[PDB]
Protein backbone atom coordinates (compact mmCIF):
# COMPACT_ATOMS: atom_id res chain seq x y z
CA UNK A 1 0.00 0.00 0.00
CA UNK A 2 1.35 3.38 -1.13
CA UNK A 3 -0.40 6.73 -0.67
CA UNK A 4 2.55 8.79 -1.95
CA UNK A 5 2.12 8.05 -5.68
CA UNK A 6 -0.03 10.02 -8.13
CA UNK A 7 -1.58 7.53 -10.55
CA UNK A 8 -3.73 9.96 -12.55
CA UNK A 9 -1.24 10.19 -15.43
CA UNK A 10 -3.48 8.82 -18.18
CA UNK A 11 -4.65 12.26 -19.29
CA UNK A 12 -1.05 13.07 -20.19
CA UNK A 13 -1.69 10.89 -23.27
CA UNK A 14 -5.11 12.27 -24.27
CA UNK A 15 -5.22 13.60 -27.83
CA UNK A 16 -7.57 16.06 -29.53
CA UNK A 17 -10.21 13.46 -30.47
CA UNK A 18 -10.05 11.29 -27.32
CA UNK A 19 -13.41 12.48 -25.97
CA UNK A 20 -15.17 12.00 -29.31
CA UNK A 21 -13.49 8.62 -29.83
CA UNK A 22 -14.83 7.53 -26.45
CA UNK A 23 -18.28 8.83 -27.43
CA UNK A 24 -18.13 6.82 -30.67
CA UNK A 25 -17.16 3.69 -28.74
CA UNK A 26 -19.92 4.25 -26.17
CA UNK A 27 -22.53 4.70 -28.91
CA UNK A 28 -22.77 0.89 -29.03
CA UNK A 29 -24.12 0.27 -25.51
CA UNK A 30 -26.75 3.04 -25.58
CA UNK A 31 -30.45 2.31 -25.23
CA UNK A 32 -32.67 3.40 -28.14
CA UNK A 33 -33.56 7.07 -27.91
CA UNK A 34 -37.16 8.22 -27.37
CA UNK A 35 -38.99 10.18 -30.04
CA UNK A 36 -41.33 13.16 -29.88
CA UNK A 37 -43.12 12.13 -33.08
CA UNK A 38 -41.58 14.79 -35.34
CA UNK A 39 -38.41 15.16 -37.35
CA UNK A 40 -38.01 18.66 -35.85
CA UNK A 41 -40.07 21.35 -34.10
CA UNK A 42 -40.39 22.92 -37.58
CA UNK A 43 -41.98 19.79 -39.06
Amino acid sequence: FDNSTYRNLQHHEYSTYTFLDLNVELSKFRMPQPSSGRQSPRH
Binding site: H12, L20, N23, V24, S27, Q33, H43
Partner: protein, 217 residues
Protein backbone atom coordinates in the same frame (compact mmCIF):
# COMPACT_ATOMS: atom_id res chain seq x y z
CA UNK B 1 -12.24 45.94 -19.85
CA UNK B 2 -14.10 45.98 -23.15
CA UNK B 3 -14.17 42.75 -25.12
CA UNK B 4 -12.49 44.10 -28.24
CA UNK B 5 -13.85 41.36 -30.49
CA UNK B 6 -16.61 42.38 -32.89
CA UNK B 7 -19.95 40.57 -33.10
CA UNK B 8 -20.74 41.29 -36.75
CA UNK B 9 -19.23 39.47 -39.71
CA UNK B 10 -17.80 41.17 -42.80
CA UNK B 11 -16.73 38.99 -45.70
CA UNK B 12 -13.00 38.70 -46.39
CA UNK B 13 -11.03 36.77 -49.02
CA UNK B 14 -9.89 34.43 -46.23
CA UNK B 15 -13.31 34.14 -44.52
CA UNK B 16 -16.35 34.10 -46.80
CA UNK B 17 -19.26 31.68 -47.42
CA UNK B 18 -17.18 30.06 -50.19
CA UNK B 19 -14.18 29.41 -47.94
CA UNK B 20 -13.49 25.66 -48.30
CA UNK B 21 -14.64 23.66 -45.29
CA UNK B 22 -15.91 20.10 -44.98
CA UNK B 23 -15.75 17.42 -42.31
CA UNK B 24 -13.47 14.44 -42.75
CA UNK B 25 -15.17 11.01 -42.91
CA UNK B 26 -13.98 10.18 -39.39
CA UNK B 27 -15.48 13.47 -38.24
CA UNK B 28 -18.73 12.44 -39.95
CA UNK B 29 -18.71 9.18 -37.98
CA UNK B 30 -18.14 11.21 -34.82
CA UNK B 31 -21.01 13.50 -35.85
CA UNK B 32 -23.31 10.49 -36.19
CA UNK B 33 -22.24 9.29 -32.74
CA UNK B 34 -22.86 12.76 -31.27
CA UNK B 35 -26.29 13.09 -32.88
CA UNK B 36 -27.42 9.66 -31.69
CA UNK B 37 -27.08 10.81 -28.06
CA UNK B 38 -30.12 13.10 -28.18
CA UNK B 39 -33.81 12.22 -28.54
CA UNK B 40 -35.19 12.09 -32.06
CA UNK B 41 -36.86 15.33 -33.08
CA UNK B 42 -34.29 17.36 -31.10
CA UNK B 43 -31.22 17.13 -33.32
CA UNK B 44 -30.47 20.83 -32.76
CA UNK B 45 -29.06 19.81 -29.38
CA UNK B 46 -25.99 18.66 -31.32
CA UNK B 47 -25.11 22.25 -32.29
CA UNK B 48 -22.77 22.74 -29.32
CA UNK B 49 -20.55 19.61 -29.74
CA UNK B 50 -20.51 19.39 -33.54
CA UNK B 51 -19.52 23.05 -33.86
CA UNK B 52 -16.68 22.37 -31.43
CA UNK B 53 -15.72 19.34 -33.53
CA UNK B 54 -15.40 21.67 -36.51
CA UNK B 55 -13.05 23.87 -34.49
CA UNK B 56 -11.15 20.72 -33.50
CA UNK B 57 -10.51 19.95 -37.19
CA UNK B 58 -9.88 23.40 -38.68
CA UNK B 59 -8.51 25.27 -35.66
CA UNK B 60 -11.04 28.09 -35.77
CA UNK B 61 -14.59 28.70 -37.04
CA UNK B 62 -14.97 30.38 -40.44
CA UNK B 63 -18.44 31.42 -41.55
CA UNK B 64 -18.53 28.46 -43.95
CA UNK B 65 -17.96 26.08 -41.03
CA UNK B 66 -21.01 27.49 -39.25
CA UNK B 67 -22.99 27.21 -42.49
CA UNK B 68 -21.90 23.57 -42.86
CA UNK B 69 -22.92 22.75 -39.29
CA UNK B 70 -26.29 24.45 -39.82
CA UNK B 71 -26.90 22.54 -43.06
CA UNK B 72 -25.89 19.21 -41.50
CA UNK B 73 -28.15 19.65 -38.47
CA UNK B 74 -30.99 21.29 -40.48
CA UNK B 75 -30.90 24.28 -38.11
CA UNK B 76 -31.30 27.89 -39.33
CA UNK B 77 -27.83 29.42 -39.74
CA UNK B 78 -28.66 32.36 -37.46
CA UNK B 79 -29.04 29.92 -34.56
CA UNK B 80 -25.53 28.59 -35.19
CA UNK B 81 -24.28 32.19 -35.39
CA UNK B 82 -25.95 32.90 -32.03
CA UNK B 83 -24.26 29.87 -30.47
CA UNK B 84 -20.86 30.72 -31.96
CA UNK B 85 -20.97 34.34 -30.77
CA UNK B 86 -22.33 33.49 -27.31
CA UNK B 87 -19.73 30.99 -26.09
CA UNK B 88 -16.17 32.18 -25.50
CA UNK B 89 -14.33 28.96 -26.41
CA UNK B 90 -15.38 29.23 -30.07
CA UNK B 91 -12.69 30.88 -32.21
CA UNK B 92 -14.26 33.08 -34.88
CA UNK B 93 -10.76 34.26 -35.85
CA UNK B 94 -7.59 32.24 -36.50
CA UNK B 95 -5.42 31.73 -33.43
CA UNK B 96 -1.90 30.49 -32.88
CA UNK B 97 -0.90 26.85 -32.66
CA UNK B 98 -0.86 27.24 -28.86
CA UNK B 99 -3.64 29.30 -27.26
CA UNK B 100 -2.28 30.54 -23.93
CA UNK B 101 -5.07 31.53 -21.52
CA UNK B 102 -3.92 32.90 -18.16
CA UNK B 103 -6.45 33.39 -15.37
CA UNK B 104 -6.61 36.85 -13.78
CA UNK B 105 -9.67 36.53 -11.53
CA UNK B 106 -9.39 37.49 -7.86
CA UNK B 107 -8.30 34.10 -6.40
CA UNK B 108 -5.67 33.76 -9.13
CA UNK B 109 -4.77 37.46 -9.02
CA UNK B 110 -4.10 37.21 -5.27
CA UNK B 111 -1.39 34.62 -5.93
CA UNK B 112 0.54 36.94 -8.28
CA UNK B 113 -1.05 36.17 -11.64
CA UNK B 114 0.20 39.49 -13.01
CA UNK B 115 3.76 38.21 -12.64
CA UNK B 116 2.94 35.26 -14.90
CA UNK B 117 1.26 37.62 -17.36
CA UNK B 118 4.28 39.93 -17.61
CA UNK B 119 6.67 36.97 -17.81
CA UNK B 120 4.73 35.58 -20.78
CA UNK B 121 4.58 39.03 -22.38
CA UNK B 122 8.33 39.60 -22.05
CA UNK B 123 9.21 36.08 -23.22
CA UNK B 124 6.96 36.20 -26.29
CA UNK B 125 7.07 39.92 -27.09
CA UNK B 126 3.29 40.14 -27.51
CA UNK B 127 0.48 41.78 -25.57
CA UNK B 128 -2.64 40.26 -23.99
CA UNK B 129 -4.54 40.05 -27.26
CA UNK B 130 -2.00 39.53 -30.02
CA UNK B 131 -0.49 36.57 -31.86
CA UNK B 132 3.23 36.04 -32.36
CA UNK B 133 4.42 36.55 -35.96
CA UNK B 134 5.35 32.86 -36.11
CA UNK B 135 1.62 32.15 -35.48
CA UNK B 136 2.56 29.64 -32.77
CA UNK B 137 1.22 31.47 -29.70
CA UNK B 138 -1.78 33.63 -28.83
CA UNK B 139 -2.03 35.08 -25.32
CA UNK B 140 -5.31 36.21 -23.72
CA UNK B 141 -6.66 36.68 -20.20
CA UNK B 142 -9.62 34.57 -19.07
CA UNK B 143 -11.87 34.32 -16.04
CA UNK B 144 -11.74 31.57 -13.42
CA UNK B 145 -10.82 28.17 -14.85
CA UNK B 146 -11.80 26.06 -11.83
CA UNK B 147 -8.25 25.56 -10.51
CA UNK B 148 -8.19 28.44 -8.04
CA UNK B 149 -6.40 26.44 -5.34
CA UNK B 150 -3.51 25.85 -7.76
CA UNK B 151 -3.14 29.56 -8.58
CA UNK B 152 -1.37 30.93 -10.57
CA UNK B 153 -2.46 28.71 -13.47
CA UNK B 154 -2.57 28.76 -17.26
CA UNK B 155 -4.36 26.74 -19.94
CA UNK B 156 -2.80 25.71 -23.25
CA UNK B 157 -4.85 23.63 -25.72
CA UNK B 158 -6.74 21.54 -23.11
CA UNK B 159 -3.79 21.38 -20.67
CA UNK B 160 -3.64 22.98 -17.23
CA UNK B 161 -0.25 24.21 -16.00
CA UNK B 162 -0.62 25.24 -12.37
CA UNK B 163 1.39 26.61 -9.43
CA UNK B 164 3.24 28.75 -11.94
CA UNK B 165 6.30 30.89 -11.32
CA UNK B 166 7.79 33.24 -13.93
CA UNK B 167 10.72 30.89 -14.55
CA UNK B 168 8.28 27.98 -14.74
CA UNK B 169 6.13 29.58 -17.44
CA UNK B 170 9.29 30.64 -19.29
CA UNK B 171 10.54 27.05 -19.32
CA UNK B 172 7.12 25.77 -20.40
CA UNK B 173 7.16 28.21 -23.32
CA UNK B 174 10.71 27.12 -24.18
CA UNK B 175 9.69 23.46 -24.14
CA UNK B 176 6.65 24.18 -26.32
CA UNK B 177 8.78 26.09 -28.85
CA UNK B 178 11.37 23.29 -29.16
CA UNK B 179 8.79 20.79 -30.47
CA UNK B 180 8.08 19.03 -27.17
CA UNK B 181 4.96 18.87 -25.00
CA UNK B 182 5.05 19.75 -21.28
CA UNK B 183 3.67 17.65 -18.46
CA UNK B 184 0.37 19.14 -17.22
CA UNK B 185 -0.44 19.71 -13.58
CA UNK B 186 1.11 21.54 -10.64
CA UNK B 187 4.70 22.71 -11.07
CA UNK B 188 5.80 22.90 -7.43
CA UNK B 189 6.10 19.27 -6.33
CA UNK B 190 2.38 18.91 -5.57
CA UNK B 191 0.83 17.05 -8.56
CA UNK B 192 -2.57 17.32 -6.83
CA UNK B 193 -4.94 19.66 -5.00
CA UNK B 194 -3.33 18.47 -1.76
CA UNK B 195 -1.86 20.74 0.90
CA UNK B 196 1.60 21.80 -0.19
CA UNK B 197 3.14 19.77 2.63
CA UNK B 198 1.94 17.37 5.30
CA UNK B 199 -1.20 15.79 3.81
CA UNK B 200 -3.40 16.91 6.69
CA UNK B 201 -6.11 14.38 5.75
CA UNK B 202 -6.68 11.18 3.74
CA UNK B 203 -3.66 9.33 5.13
CA UNK B 204 -5.24 6.13 6.47
CA UNK B 205 -5.62 3.19 4.07
CA UNK B 206 -9.04 3.37 2.40
CA UNK B 207 -11.73 1.18 3.93
CA UNK B 208 -12.87 -1.94 2.11
CA UNK B 209 -16.27 -2.57 0.53
CA UNK B 210 -19.22 -2.87 2.88
CA UNK B 211 -17.46 -1.27 5.85
CA UNK B 212 -20.29 1.01 6.97
CA UNK B 213 -23.31 -0.63 5.34
CA UNK B 214 -26.49 -0.35 7.38
CA UNK B 215 -28.58 -3.30 8.51
CA UNK B 216 -31.02 -4.77 6.02
CA UNK B 217 -28.90 -4.11 2.93
Amino acid sequence: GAGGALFVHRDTPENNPDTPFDFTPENYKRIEAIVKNYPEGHKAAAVLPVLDLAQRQNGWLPISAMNKVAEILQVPPMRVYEVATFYTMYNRKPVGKYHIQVCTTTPCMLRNSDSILEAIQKKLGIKVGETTPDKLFTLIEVECLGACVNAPMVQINDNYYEDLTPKDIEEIIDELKAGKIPKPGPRSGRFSCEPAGGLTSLTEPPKGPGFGVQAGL
